[PDB]
């Protein structure tokens, strides 16, 4: 039940250099840095329902069992296949251009993630306080 409930962003540590080593244009980057976004979060033990409130009535839910292989889905609406594992309390997952660790610290939900571009690769830290 950690992890159950709503969530704003407070703070995203890496913000600017992951959104530009994944290609995100520097004049988006500006507008995007005071976006705040809610996360809600329906965890019954190992199943879980997060659902991202994304501009414009954009709402992302992603239904997952823990370890155990998931119908996923991305921002963009690209369909894909993953596993979250939970490690010691952390929910993570990884590819190989990409890896998220999603744990409670705090109090707080924080979400690091890892991705590859063509320059090297980029870190982000965000950070959620319950509403
Ligand atoms: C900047 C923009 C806000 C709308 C706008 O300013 O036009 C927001 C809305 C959706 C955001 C993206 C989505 O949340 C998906 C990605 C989530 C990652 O944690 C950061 C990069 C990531 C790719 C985001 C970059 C940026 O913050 C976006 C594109
Ligand atoms: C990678 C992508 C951000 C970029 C994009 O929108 O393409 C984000 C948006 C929704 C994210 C997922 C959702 O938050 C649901 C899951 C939440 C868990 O805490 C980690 C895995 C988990 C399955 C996430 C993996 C990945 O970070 C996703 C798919
Ligand atoms: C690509 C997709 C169209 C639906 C589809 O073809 O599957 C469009 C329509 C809704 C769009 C999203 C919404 O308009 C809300 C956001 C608006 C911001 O200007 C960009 C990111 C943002 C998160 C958008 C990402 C992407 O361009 C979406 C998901
Ligand atoms: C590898 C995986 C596809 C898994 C599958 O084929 O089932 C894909 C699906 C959507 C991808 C993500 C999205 O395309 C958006 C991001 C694009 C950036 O160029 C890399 C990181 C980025 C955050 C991607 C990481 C990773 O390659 C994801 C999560």
Redesign the pocket.
């Given at each position: 039940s950690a992890f159950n409930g709503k969530w704003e962003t407070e703070s995203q540590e890496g913000y600017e250099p992951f959104c530009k080593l994944?290609?995100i244009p520097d004049d988006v980057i500006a507008k995007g840095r005071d976006f705040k976004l809610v996360t809600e979060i329906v965890q019954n033990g190992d199943d879980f329902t997060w659902t991202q409130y994304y501009p414009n009535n954009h709402v992302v839910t992603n239904k997952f069992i823990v370890g155990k292989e998931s119908d996923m889905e991305?921002v963009?609406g690209?369909k894909?296949?993953?596993i979250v594992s939970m490690e010691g309390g952390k929910l993570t997952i990884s590819?190989?251009?990409?890896q998220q660790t999603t744990e409670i610290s705090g109090g707080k939900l924080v979400e690091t993630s890892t991705?590859?571009?063509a320059q090297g690769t980029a870190v982000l830290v965000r950070t959620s306080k319950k509403v």
């Open positions: 994944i290609g991305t963009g690209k894909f296949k993953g590819f190989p251009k990409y991705a590859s571009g």
